[PDB]
């Protein structure tokens, strides 16, 4: 199991724009078009991404094209960031993919907020950080996945999406 197929599973494949859990205006595998509420916009940004007229309509490969991009640009958004590199860099290959999900699910900003559960995530302090991100809107707003990326966490392993 990787970063990709994890992402996979929590994200889920839409070949046709949708919502969000949010609301947003979201496609292919959890890449977000717009935080507006315009479907235009929407198809506005899509055309943009994949430089052809989508007409709200994408093909698989398109689809995973995005995702690429989404990935890397997530891990490099967590390279960059200061708050979360020194993180990243301390833990081990699971838990790093527990924290990428974080990202690209709520941006890197997001994910900074977790002051707290990183610090002790950042002191290998399994139990007490998985109960703090328990804490969160986060959890509230989508437990299951939540739940998911934060016994990986807690874990180690890829338990959690097997
Ligand atoms: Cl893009
Ligand atoms: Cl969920």
Excluded: C
Aim: hydrophobic share 40%; proline share 2%; glycine share 6%.
């Amino acid at each position: 199991m990787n970063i990709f197929e994890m992402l996979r599973i929590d994200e889920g494949l839409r070949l046709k724009i949708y919502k969000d859990t949010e609301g947003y205006y979201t496609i292919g595998i959890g890449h977000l078009l717009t935080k507006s509420p315009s479907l235009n916009a929407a198809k506005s940004e899509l055309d943009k991404a994949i430089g052809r007229n989508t007409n709200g309509v994408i093909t698989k490969d398109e689809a995973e094209k995005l995702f690429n991009q989404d990935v890397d640009a997530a891990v490099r958004g967590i390279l960059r960031n200061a708050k979360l590199k020194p993180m990243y860099d301390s833990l081990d290959a699971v838990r790093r993919a527990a924290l990428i999900n974080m990202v690209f699910q709520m941006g890197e900003t997001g994910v900074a907020g977790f002051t707290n559960s990183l610090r002790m995530l950042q002191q290998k302090r399994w139990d007490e950080a998985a109960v703090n991100l328990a804490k969160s809107r986060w959890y509230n707003q989508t437990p299951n996945r939540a739940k998911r990326v934060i016994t990986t966490f807690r874990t180690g392993t890829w338990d959690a999406y097997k």
